[PDB]
UniProtKB/Swiss-Prot annotation:
Zn(2+) binds at H293, H297, E316. It comes from Escherichia coli (strain K12). The record marks Y377 as: Transition state stabilizer. This is Aminopeptidase N. Substrate binds at E117, G257, A258, M259, E260, N261. GO terms for cellular component: plasma membrane. Transmembrane segments: none annotated. Its EC number is 3.4.11.2. Keywords: Aminopeptidase, Cell inner membrane, Cell membrane, Hydrolase, Membrane, Metal-binding, Metalloprotease, Protease, Zinc. It is found in: Cell inner membrane. Disulfide bonds: none annotated.
Length: 866
């Protein structure tokens, strides 16, 4: 498999302006007829090079003339000696039932559906499968009426008819030119939830949610979220929907989360289906964010698309930023920001420290499906957020407006977007652009000095990004570094110098820089990198008392949580080192007291309290360490939970009881109290056994919603309580028929602290609710084990690696994209001790030698073994 390079971009020799597709649909043999209107832009002697994968070519015509000047080569059909303008007609066959990779046209249960991003359309017909080729699509679908009563594609129905032998057809037209990655087709039998949204300017939009028969009871929340998204994009960004119908189809077999196909989104059912007894608060909020995300792509992705796949973050960074803003505006901004920072620090930083490290705009790609990443998405959003920080909302929106004005109806680049922001705002972003081209996490080091003679406070700030495997050269970035200074009373000290106010967002642009503030009347306690103003590691020599002061006094809820994280970090590091020396947990009294104060503070938002009382995950803890000891980390996490459970037992029970809610509402105040109640339950599960066992089993049995039932079940597993096996069995017996609900149980099994966890996981490969054919099941059992139980995955006998090798040997052939998701924990080998590295290296070498090794895995394995 050959690497492709951003610097090699060249405008296409041919454009296609219009494509008329006909599908004669059948699960075993689908016949595709594609009539494209082409225009040569390149040299008159250039051939037309069409991409295609696993196609049975039937015929090639040019202006209805059977063509003789063509040849098929690996991944391509090369057509020679063409006119400047012509009609290309390709007929080919494909087999949806054989498509286990779930890219192109495939089968999901009894339905047929597509996934075309990034390069799936070439698995359907021979085409210019590159996103800078935009064409107007018409799509005719012919199928068995009984099997496929609904035949959907992008846009509007323009024709329909019936045929002999029980077949029928529907033709769709989408007036907006699009790259083929936004093509979609769905055929099947569905229940349909129908609603309307009327745009601000009065366009009535038909909303249609297609779900498997029997699932209508689980559709209203997704529909509500769609309308919420539509309204918010109008209010916040001034953007309205641009078509007459909006369709969403929920499918059970889907590699990603969801897909923004123009006017016909296709969603993993996980991000659509919810009812109070099947879905948790987190599920509801995830459905809201993913529904919003795909909706927001209508402008940031569809109306303006990507020139090439190296520009993926142009749509993903910006659309993730949009989904975060949507969630934050509608819900708790603090909780959203906290959660997104947990993801950055605990998951994205790990990626940026790995062999797969890449800039948010990659320079080199072998398999583009490998670049739908935490970096491109979440760090992408952090980069957009930094622009927002530097410009402010008003200028940021002017930049959005200029971006659309310039680029609506076209395929654009990351650089185009930055230019629009720069031009609209008059803020210089030339240095800022380096964020697009440099990988790795910057480390920002802060030293301070207070001079009582001059009443001046000085911050000496330095930055460096360690080299990464992809980049030997690193340079200083333009880092927006937000600060606040607090006096002894917790009042904010005005920032000023030389008689003029100074903006609280400092421009840290050099390797080392000095910032001086005057009229600092009292030695300040600083809050640094406020609201995580840049995606960086902060090094500052905090005292415990500075941190607890901030937990008490910081103006932004995020700063209070972040201070708690810095406080915990010190003692997590302390206790991991202790664990390695065979010593038990040590925690100063004043640290437990800080958390007691959070529990007993009447004024604190329950949403914030819940997050402060949620310990960093084992993945967040791992990133505190150069060399990861996953067993020490897991055992310290448990020990810390137990210590706090004991020290805070009375306060935890008081707050647990006080936050009881007899009514279940998916409303933000209710969610906050429930999140706090369940955060308390976590610790209580680790209290005196009988007490804990009664409390947990009672909650599981009395729960009137899945959030509370799952919190109890999770606690029983985490604390290995007596009731665990009974509750797990009850859940299986009640829910085995429901894959999405069973995913929660597979995750619990996979992440169990039980000594026999791997044995149980292996056994579950035969479970009635498990199947290797379904990405969700695979990720919930195998993915969760390898990625979310690093203590068990990294068992010293190497049994975890061997298990993953077995699974990947299957998935490499079945579904390379899911295989590539699942190999990620193995490619982190250099973060581990030498004994583990050698076993992980051995595992990787076994995979490297697989017959028919997918490009997806080849790319990761080669980087990991380098
Ligand atoms: Zn997206």
């Amino acid at each position: 498999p050959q690497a492709k390079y951003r610097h090699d971009y060249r405008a296409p020799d041919y454009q296609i302006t219009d494509i008329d597709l006909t599908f004669d649909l059948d699960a075993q043999k689908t016949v595709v007829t594609a009539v494209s209107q082409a225009v040569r832009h390149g040299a008159s002697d250039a051939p037309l090079r069409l991409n295609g994968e696993d196609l049975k070519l039937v015929s090639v015509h040019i202006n209805d003339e059977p063509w003789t000047a063509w040849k098929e080569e690996e991944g391509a059909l090369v057509i020679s000696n063409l006119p400047e303008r012509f009609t290309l007609k390709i007929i080919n066959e494909i087999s949806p039932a054989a498509n286990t990779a779930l890219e192109g046209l495939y089968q999901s249960g009894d339905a047929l559906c597509t996934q075309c991003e990034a390069e799936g359309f070439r698995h359907i017909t021979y085409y210019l499968d590159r996103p800078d080729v935009l064409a107007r699509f018409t799509t005719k679908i012919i199928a068995d009426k009984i099997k496929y009563p609904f035949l959907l594609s992008n846009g509007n129905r323009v024709a329909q008819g019936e045929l002999e032998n029980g077949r029928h057809w529907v033709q769709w037209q989408d007036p907006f030119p699009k790259p083929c990655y936004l093509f979609a087709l769905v055929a099947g039998d569905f229940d349909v939830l129908r609603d309307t949204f009327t745009t601000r300017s009065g366009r009535e939009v038909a909303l249609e949610l297609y779900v498997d028969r029997g699932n209508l009871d689980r559709a209203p929340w997704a529909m509500t979220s769609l309308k919420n998204s539509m309204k918010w994009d109008e209010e916040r960004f001034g953007l309205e929907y641009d078509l007459d119908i909006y369709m969403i189809v929920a499918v059970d077999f889907f590699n990603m989360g969801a897909m923004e196909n123009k006017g016909l989104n296709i969603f993993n059912s996980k991000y659509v289906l919810a009812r109070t007894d099947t879905a948790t608060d987190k599920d509801y909020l995830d459905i809201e964010r993913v529904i919003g995300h795909e909706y927001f792509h209508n402008w940031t992705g569809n109306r303006v698309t990507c020139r090439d796949w190296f520009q993926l973050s142009l749509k993903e960074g910006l659309t993730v930023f949009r989904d975060q803003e949507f969630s934050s505006d509608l819900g708790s901004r603090a909780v959203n920001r906290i959660n997104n920072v947990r993801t950055m620090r605990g998951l994205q930083f790990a990626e940026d420290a790995s062999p797969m490290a890449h800039p948010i705009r990659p320079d080199m790609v072998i398999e583009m499906n490998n670049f739908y990443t935490l970096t491109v998405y979440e760090k992408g959003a952090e980069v957009i957020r930094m622009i927002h920080t530097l410009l402010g909302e008003e200028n940021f929106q002017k930049g959005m407006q200029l971006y659309f004005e310039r680029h609506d109806g076209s395929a654009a680049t990351c650089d185009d977007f930055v230019q629009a922001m720069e031009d609209a705002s008059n803020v210089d972003l030339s240095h800022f652009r380096r964020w697009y081209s440099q990988s790795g996490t910057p480390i920002v080091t802060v030293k301070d000095d207070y001079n009582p003679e001059t009443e001046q406070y000085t911050l000496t700030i330095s930055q460096r990004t360690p080299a990464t495997p992809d980049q030997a050269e690193k340079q200083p970035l333009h880092i927006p570094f937000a600060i606040e200074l607090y006096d002894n009373e917790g009042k904010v000290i005005p920032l000023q110098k030389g008689g003029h106010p100074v903006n609280s967002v400092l421009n840290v642009t050099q390797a080392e820089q000095t910032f001086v503030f005057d009229n600092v009347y009292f030695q300040p306690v600083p809050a640094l990198l406020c609201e995580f103003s840049a995606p960086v590691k902060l090094e500052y020599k905090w005292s415990d008392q500075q941190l607890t002061f901030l937990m008490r006094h910081a103006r932004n809820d995020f700063s209070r949580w972040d201070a708690a994280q810095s406080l915990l970090a010190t003692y997590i590091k302390l206790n991991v080192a202790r664990h390695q020396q065979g010593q038990p947990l040590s925690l100063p009294v004043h640290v437990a007291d800080a958390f007691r104060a959070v529990l007993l503070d009447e004024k604190i938002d329950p949403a914030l309290a819940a997050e402060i009382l949620t310990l960093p995950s084992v993945n967040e803890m791992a990133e505190l360490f150069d060399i990861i000891d996953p067993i020490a980390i897991a055992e310290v996490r448990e020990a810390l939970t137990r210590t706090l459970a004991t020290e805070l037992a009375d306060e935890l029970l008081a707050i647990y009881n006080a936050n009881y809610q007899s009514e279940y509402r998916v409303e933000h105040e209710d969610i906050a109290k429930r999140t706090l109640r369940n955060a308390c339950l976590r610790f209580l599960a680790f209290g005196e056994t009988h007490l804990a066992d009664v409390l947990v089993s009672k909650q599981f049995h009395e729960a009137n919603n899945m959030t509370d039932a799952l919190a109890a079940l999770s606690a029983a597993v985490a604390a290995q309580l007596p009731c665990r096996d009974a509750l797990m069995q009850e859940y299986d017996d009640k829910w085995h028929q429901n894959g999405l609900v069973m995913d929660k149980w597979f995750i619990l099994q996979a992440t169990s602290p039980a000594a026999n966890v791997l044995e149980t996981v292996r056994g579950l490969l035969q479970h009635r609710s498990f199947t290797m054919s379904n990405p969700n099941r695979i990720r919930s059992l195998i993915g969760a084990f390898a990625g979310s139980n690093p203590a068990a995955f990294h068992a010293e006998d190497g049994s975890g690696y061997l298990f993953l090798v077995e699974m990947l040997t299957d998935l490499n052939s079945r579904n390379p994209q899911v295989a590539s998701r699942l190999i990620e924990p193995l490619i982190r080998l250099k973060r581990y001790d030498a004994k583990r590295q050698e076993k992980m290296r051995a595992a990787l070498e076994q995979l490297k030698g697989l017959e028919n090794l997918s490009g997806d895995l080849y790319e990761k394995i080669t980087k990991a073994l380098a």
